[PDB]
């Protein structure tokens, strides 16, 4: 384990070797204008991560900074992306915790990993933790057929996420989480996650700006009407418009005969290909060849849940 | 290990170093008058902690003081706050154990950390043990998916918590939970006070909104009766969260995403004097919803009205 | 290790120095066998297995050799750790006490030697008595799932040690989950007895035995408080008496006086009677830790397998 | 250690003194083999395996060599250890007793030393009988899930060490958990059944040989009403009958005085047939008929009866 700023150290004698290794093993060039839409999530991150680093004299008392946020939405949009975006464009240490680190063969080695994780995140810095796929980790607490060791992991998160009983020695921490199934969190753990926020599928203008964003760096023609592509991809998620642009960019390879020249005269035709632009024929065939991973019953259920018990 | 009052010393020789360390590792200035409501819990804590220090010539015969108490109710209502307020107002040695101090991968340490804990709690002082989330620790005994090394911990809690007419050193075991129908039938008997804790009614949210808004400059336009009547089913934590989101909504009217570095602290001086208006409550009351619908409140009330001893 | 009667000595040489400290850690005249009400059958078995061999030991020979074990089993609050204290107070015998935690060590093969030292010390000292509390731990069938390897040698040491020299040990166990016992261990417990919740006439004697010693009124009708409980576990009637007795402190409110003239108000409240309003206001705040299906399961098991 | 016959001496110099103490601590209050009711086949094998080679050592020379192992399976209470103690008493063979608390061995590489020293000491005193009680323990599967790195050495030390005359008994309640390589080293897997209608009357008539019964000669009824009694429960029935002879005179009221002449008034009191009827209402069998059926199926599938 390295030292922190201001030259102190950490006395990790009470925990074994492999637990320290398994918490140490979870420790650029992105920016928060590379995320199309999602205004209120950017607002909450701006007033709970970036503003206390600048003006710490304001957030004292009732205006204390937040310490949790869970993003709930359909499986297409940008939730994993906003965590790496806030990890790059900040000055705090980043803990990526998945559900496969809080797991060991012995008895009583998950809760000690969670305890060491929160102690390290409080010791180092004003850090933030990003628990990805929270619903495989904390489910309901009184279900039929859960193990007797996952219950202690949920109880450890419950005891550790609120605390720091001394009003002095206030070192900040911030827990971020993403879910596709938000109606399956415990009623006691859902209280600690203040600021439940829904993330919607992109609208018309978000689809237009995302097509404009991803189609730069590659030369296109001037006959592409972006309004027709923005109005014809009705029902597309956020991670399907990028797949549409990738299919439209490789269709300029599919229209030439490259399977025929098998090795011979193959390196020669690739020379003139890298500057050939993409006309409207490729976007027409890419619309004809790509369908969304639809079924908006999950989007409807998640929107009704975050409209009932949500706090933007 | 430290000494105690009257200069004695404990002789911890038969226990290894990492057990007495794990028990040593579990040993601001708020008053009991800021907890809103919960009158009967204050009454039992009063006549079980405060009065045996002032006049001990009364609690002698049949009136020996209570030895346990379990709070039960929906999440976010005021349990760990009453535990920290008792730790801050009394003069007792306070232990805060949980389900992760009592576990170790060796065989025969889970049922020795508990024994060392109770021996220190009876040796030191008129102490108070606060076992948190006891539904994790003591479950139903003759169950299906129970590993063998939890039966010994439940048996140790059953053996320690009931024992000569001498040894008049007091130990008061306070415990909190929010799924009370999973406690063992041999352990539900030991906790001889099983009080229920309700969500606040329409007169205990007015005092809570008045209490959390002392310090921030507000106007004289807001009327607390309408804000007490438009919140139904809110917990204590949700009312505190609403009173926080109002002041952050005072921040959210100015576009502070625009200024970058230059005199931003000078720009933040005009903001640290603005008053919290009614528009901020009309926005924050639409921005905040309760955390859970009523289905565990009704089950906890149906349990504590048939098996509870208030 | 102290010497026994008649000045003998034990040779604890083959054992380590922390096993003997644990067994010595397991090892008066205050209570009596009249303080417990009800339970005539277990009192008869104790009287014929503990007391009467001491007076006329020329009678208990041959077929009438005295009993060697017992199991008290029933609902979780009816009084079965009280009778172990009442037989420890009212006897002249070495009374061990072994819970489930004075057997475990994290070293391999010291958990099944504490048992052997316990039985050898119990033989060597006296006509002694062992009281293994919560016998459903260290019980269970031996062909179970998730059973550790040391926790079978514990059961095998209990199995090989508890049979087969006119020296007497009387192992007495108590539990509230009786059906989770071994098949070759509940053969050795030669008397398996049931204890019920108290009936209508036992609860009146329990009320009168707990309430005496505290000055009361002469208008309390005890028969109504005996007929009005109807399901109280026998350890909850003491709780009803205590909540009735402490209710004289919640009638004169002391939460308003803090220090100022309080200690004389606690003298004016020292000798105040317990009127009927106390019991009427205490019956609406005490309920049992009920669920009588545990009592019905224990009744069915002790009526299909009990040997009184 | 003592010496052996013919004046020789054993040189146990390569072992520590405490291993010699732990093996020496295991090695005649007269019983008789006629004091056990039932089980003629087990006595038949014990006869042919222990008693005949003493008298006719010329007949057992080659391929008619005696048996060298045995393992008794059955329900709890059917009399497995009584056969072992009876054959321990009335024989000039050196007896032993091995249990699972006797191979404790807190150090490493020391349990196999105890086992090997036991089997070296058995082939020193030339007739020898070993009685490994409760062989369920130490007899798990050699590739099981939760097992130490030392218990497999114990099972391997037996499986190499089973091959100067010895004889190894055993006894089990759950015989299906025996290992496959440990099973075929045992030459005879016998079943031990519950008492029938004829054996129970003999057991009630044998146990009440000291106290005076008077006219309750209706022993066929007592052999009829005890349906599934497990052999070790009819002895509890006779014991409860004698203590119920004690219980009819109320003795919990006297306090010291007249507690000798009244105890002399009961020393000649005979057992009427009200007490057997009052003793059948308070004795029930210790288990159900489950483990009987399971061991019966295991002996039908594997038991070389």
């Amino acid at each position: 384990l390295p030292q922190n700023s201001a030259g102190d150290s950490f006395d990790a004698s009470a925990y074994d070797a492999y637990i320290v290794q398994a918490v140490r093993g979870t420790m650029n060039t992105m920016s928060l204008d590379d995320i199309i839409g999602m205004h209120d999530v950017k607002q909450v991150l701006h007033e709970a991560v970036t503003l206390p680093l600048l003006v710490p004299e304001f957030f004292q008392g009732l205006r204390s900074p937040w310490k949790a946020m869970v993003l709930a939405g359909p499986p297409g949009t940008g939730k994993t992306l906003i965590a790496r975006a806030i990890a790059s464009e900040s000055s705090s240490t980043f803990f990526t915790v998945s559900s496969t680190d809080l797991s060991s063969k012995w008895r009583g080695d998950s809760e000690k990993i969670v305890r060491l994780l929160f102690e390290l995140a409080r010791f180092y810095a004003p850090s933030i933790i990003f628990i990805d796929q929270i619903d495989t980790l904390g489910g309901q607490r009184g279900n039929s057929g859960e193990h007797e060791a996952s219950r202690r992991v949920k109880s450890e998160f419950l005891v550790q996420m609120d605390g720091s009983q001394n009003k002095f020695d206030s070192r900040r921490v911030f827990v971020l989480a993403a879910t596709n199934i938000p109606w399956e969190l415990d009623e006691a753990l859902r209280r600690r996650f203040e600021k439940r926020i829904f993330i919607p599928l992109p609208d018309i203008d978000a689809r237009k700006k995302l097509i404009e964003k991803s189609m730069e760096g590659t030369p296109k023609s001037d006959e592409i009407n972006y309004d027709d592509l923005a109005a014809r991809t009705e029902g597309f998620s956020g991670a399907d418009v990028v797949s549409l642009c990738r299919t439209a960019a490789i269709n300029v390879l599919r229209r030439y005969d490259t399977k025929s020249l098998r090795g011979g005269e193959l390196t020669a035709a690739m020379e003139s290909l890298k500057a050939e632009l993409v006309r409207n024929i490729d976007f027409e065939a890419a619309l004809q060849a790509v369908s969304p991973s639809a079924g908006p019953d999950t989007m409807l259920k998640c929107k009704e849940w975050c409209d009932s018990f949500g706090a933007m | 290990l430290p000494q105690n009052s009257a200069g004695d010393s404990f002789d911890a020789s038969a226990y290894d170093a990492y057990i007495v360390q794990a028990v040593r590792g579990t040993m601001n200035t708020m008053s009991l008058d800021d907890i809103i409501g919960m009158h009967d819990v204050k009454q039992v804590l009063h006549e079980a902690v405060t009065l045996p220090l002032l006049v001990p010539e009364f609690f002698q015969g049949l009136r020996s003081p209570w030895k346990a108490m379990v709070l039960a109710g929906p999440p976010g209502t005021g349990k760990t706050l009453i535990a920290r307020a008792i730790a801050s107002e009394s003069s007792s040695t306070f232990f805060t154990v949980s389900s992760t101090d009592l576990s170790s991968k060796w065989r025969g340490d889970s049922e020795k950390i508990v024994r060392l804990l109770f021996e220190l709690a009876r040796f030191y002082a008129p102490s108070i043990i606060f076992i948190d989330q006891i539904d994790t620790l003591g479950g139903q005994r003759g169950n299906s998916g129970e590993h063998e090394a939890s039966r010994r911990v439940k048996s140790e809690f059953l053996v320690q918590m009931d024992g000569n007419k001498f040894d008049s050193r007091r130990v008061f075991v306070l415990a909190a939970t929010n799924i009370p129908w999973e406690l063992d039938e041999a352990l539900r008997r030991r906790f001889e006070k099983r009080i229920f804790i309700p969500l606040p009614d329409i007169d205990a949210r007015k005092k809570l909104i008045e209490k959390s808004m002392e310090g921030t400059p507000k106007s004289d336009e807001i009327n607390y009766d309408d804000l007490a009547a438009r919140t139904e089913g809110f917990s204590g934590a949700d009312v505190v969260s609403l009173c926080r989101t109002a002041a952050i909504n005072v921040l959210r009217r100015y576009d502070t995403k625009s200024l970058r570095g230059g005199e931003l602290t000078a720009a933040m001086e005009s903001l640290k004097a603005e008053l919290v208006r009614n528009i901020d409550f009309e926005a924050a009351l639409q921005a905040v919803s309760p955390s859970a619908g009523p289905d565990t409140m009704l089950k906890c009330k149906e349990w504590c009205d048939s098996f509870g001893a208030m | 290790l102290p010497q026994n009667s008649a000045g003998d000595s034990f040779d604890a040489s083959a054992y380590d120095a922390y096993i003997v400290q644990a067994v010595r850690g397991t090892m008066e005249n205050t209570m009596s066998l009249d303080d417990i009400i009800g339970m005539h059958d277990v009192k008869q078995v104790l009287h014929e297995a503990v007391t009467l061999p001491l007076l006329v030991p020329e009678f208990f020979q041959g077929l009438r050799s005295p009993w060697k074990a017992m199991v008290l089993a029933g609902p979780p609050g009816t009084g079965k750790t009280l009778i172990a204290r009442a037989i420890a107070s009212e006897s002249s015998s070495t009374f061990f006490t072994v819970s489930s935690t004075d057997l475990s060590s994290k070293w391999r093969g010291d958990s099944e030697k504490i048992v052997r030292l316990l039985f050898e010390l119990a033989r060597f000292y006296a006509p002694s008595i062992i009281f293994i509390d919560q016998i459903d731990t260290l019980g269970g069938q031996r062909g179970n799932s998730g059973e550790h390897e040391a926790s079978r040698r514990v059961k095998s040491e209990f199995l090989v040690q508890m049979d087969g020299d006119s020296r007497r040990v009387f192992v007495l166990a108590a539990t509230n989950i009786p059906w989770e016992l071994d098949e070759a261990l509940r053969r050795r417990f030669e008397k398996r007895i049931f204890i019920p919740l108290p009936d209508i006439d036992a609860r009146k004697k329990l009320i009168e035995k707990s309430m005496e010693g505290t000055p009361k009124s002469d208008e309390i009708n005890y028969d109504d408080l005996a007929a009005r409980t109807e399901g109280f576990s026998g350890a909850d009637v003491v709780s009803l008496c205590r909540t009735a007795a402490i209710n004289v402190l919640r009638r004169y409110d002391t939460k308003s006086l803090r220090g100022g003239e309080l200690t004389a108000a606690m003298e004016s409240l020292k000798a105040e009677l317990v009127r009927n309003i106390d019991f009427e206001a205490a019956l609406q705040a005490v309920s049992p830790s009920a669920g009588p299906d545990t009592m019905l399961k224990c009744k069915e098991w002790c009526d299909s397998f009990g040997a009184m | 250690l003592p010496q052996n016959s013919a004046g020789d001496s054993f040189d146990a110099s390569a072992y520590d003194a405490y291993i010699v103490q732990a093996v020496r601590g295991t090695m005649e209050n007269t019983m008789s083999l006629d004091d056990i009711i039932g089980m003629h086949d087990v006595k038949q094998v014990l006869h042919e395996a222990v008693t005949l080679p003493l008298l006719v050592p010329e007949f057992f020379q080659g391929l008619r060599s005696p048996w060298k192992a045995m393992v008794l399976a059955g329900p709890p209470g059917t009399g497995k250890t009584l056969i072992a103690r009876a054959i321990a008493s009335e024989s000039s063979s050196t007896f032993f007793t091995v249990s699972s608390t006797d191979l404790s061995s807190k150090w490493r590489g020391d349990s196999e030393k105890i086992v090997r020293l036991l089997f070296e000491l058995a082939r020193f005193y030339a007739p020898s009988i070993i009685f490994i009680d409760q062989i369920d323990t130490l007899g798990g599967q050699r590739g099981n899930s939760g097992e130490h790195e030392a218990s497999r050495r114990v099972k391997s030390e037996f499986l190499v060490q089973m091959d100067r005359r010895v004889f190894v008994l055993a006894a089990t309640n759950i015989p299906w958990e025996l290992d496959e390589a440990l099973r075929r080293r045992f030459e005879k897997r016998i079943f031990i059944p519950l008492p029938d209608i004829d054996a129970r009357k003999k057991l009630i008539e044998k146990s009440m040989e000291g106290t005076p019964k008077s006219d309750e000669i209706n022993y066929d009824d007592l052999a009829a009403r005890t349906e599934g009694f497990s052999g070790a429960d009819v002895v509890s029935l006779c014991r409860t009958a004698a203590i119920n002879v004690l219980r009819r005179y109320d003795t919990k009221s006297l306090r010291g005085g007249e507690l000798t002449a009244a105890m002399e008034s009961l020393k000649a009191e005979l057992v009427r047939n009200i007490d057997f009827e009052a003793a059948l209402q308070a004795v029930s069998p210790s288990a159900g008929p489950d483990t009987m059926l399971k061991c019966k199926e295991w002996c039908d599938s594997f038991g070389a009866m």
Partner: peptide
Amino acid sequence: EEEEEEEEEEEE
């Protein structure tokens, strides 16, 4: 001089 200890594993 190599002592031995016992540990606890959990399974599913």
